[PDB]
Amino acid sequence: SAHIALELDKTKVKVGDVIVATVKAKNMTSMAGIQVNIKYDPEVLQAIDPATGKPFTKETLLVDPELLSNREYNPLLTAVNDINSGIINYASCYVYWDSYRESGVSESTGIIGKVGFKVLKAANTTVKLEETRFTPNSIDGTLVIDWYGQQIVGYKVIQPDLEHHHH
Amino acid sequence: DKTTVSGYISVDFDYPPESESKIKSGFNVKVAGTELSTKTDEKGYFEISGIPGDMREFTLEISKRNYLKRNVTVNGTGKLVVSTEDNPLILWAGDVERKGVQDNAINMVDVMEISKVFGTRAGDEEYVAELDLNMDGAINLFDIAIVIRHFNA
Ligand SMILES: [Ca+2]
Ligand SMILES: [Ca+2]
């Protein structure tokens, strides 16, 4: 029924290619916050802004968030990426849950955010939503809270295709 | 004849079962206007004896680092039980100690202090061990959610 998905726009690549990764939510009823962890091989892929090419560093947020962006509910966005371990670690959370609940309307389906990946090396690799040191006791490195601050569980996590070198 | 007061203290958020003993222990409980105090054990249990028998009305001051402090009034004499293991007195995490000092309010100030230490771990310059509120080995969305849950004093 519900899921968090990681999508790649391209999976068969040559060196110099830029892969766009998109994190999406589906049927995530009452969601007021989310944390996602994207694990990649930093030797093979470089995390970049998919429009400017600027490399991600520790504080860099996922680009173009759709869900959890209502100004009236006081969105709190943060990232503590570990670029050397190849981890993107992003969290976004509303602070005014009472205003959000009163609306009755759930940010259940839409884009969490995006990150690009520049291909550095001609090698088969994987980009996955995956538990890291940032996210113990998680759902495949995803943490979701509802508008009462309780963990949302029971959803699936959808992984993109493994990445292959164009030979 | 002296008065003894006992009870249980707990929390309202989820945590890993292995942290239970650390989460439930170390709540300070003090009889206001006296030096009669104690700390809760691994089950959240506390007991204080030797309260003057003539002291028929007293206040229990309950506190812990990063928790909203709580005053509970007690009326009675003898063996008194203020709460039970099934219906414990709840303290709210999220009144963050800032340079040694809490302000008795759960606020955006508290939220930002957690946000400051998001993603930090032992050995990091900024890491604060007791801001891992649910004691799961990470400071992340769940620790922020605990503060917002309690988002006022
Ligand atoms: Ca405070
Ligand atoms: Ca934690």
Author numbering:
A (entry chain A): 3 to 169
B (entry chain B): 7 to 159
List passages from the publication reporting this PDB structure:
It is now well established that a wide array of highly ordered protein-protein interactions involving dockerin and cohesin modules (defined herein as Doc and Coh, respectively) mediate both cellulosome assembly and cellulosome cell-surface attachment. In addition to ScaA, inspection of C. thermocellum genome revealed the presence of an ORF (Cthe_1806) encoding a protein comprising 2177 amino acids and containing a putative type-II Doc, which was termed CipB. Type-II Docs of primary scaffoldins ScaA and CipB in C. thermocellum possess two distinct Coh-binding surfaces that recognize different Coh partners.
ScaC2 Coh was selected, as both ScaA and CipB Docs were shown to bind preferentially to this Coh. The XDoc dyad was modelled as one single polypeptide chain of 164 amino acids with the first 98 corresponding to the X-module and the remaining to the type-II Doc. Both F-hand motif loops coordinated a calcium ion in a typical octahedral geometry. In the CtCohScaC2-XDocCipB complex the X-module stabilized both Doc calcium binding loops, while in the ScaA Coh-XDoc complex the X-module only interacted with the first calcium-binding loop of the Doc. Similar to what was observed in the CtCohScaF-XDocScaA complex, the C-terminal helix (helix 3) of CipB Doc dominated Coh recognition. In addition, the CohScaC2-XDocCipB interacting region is predominantly hydrophobic. Only two direct hydrogen bonds were identified at the ScaC2 Coh:CipB XDoc interface: Nδ2 of Asn146 Doc and O of Phe136 Coh, and N of Leu147 Doc and Oε1 of Gln37 Coh.
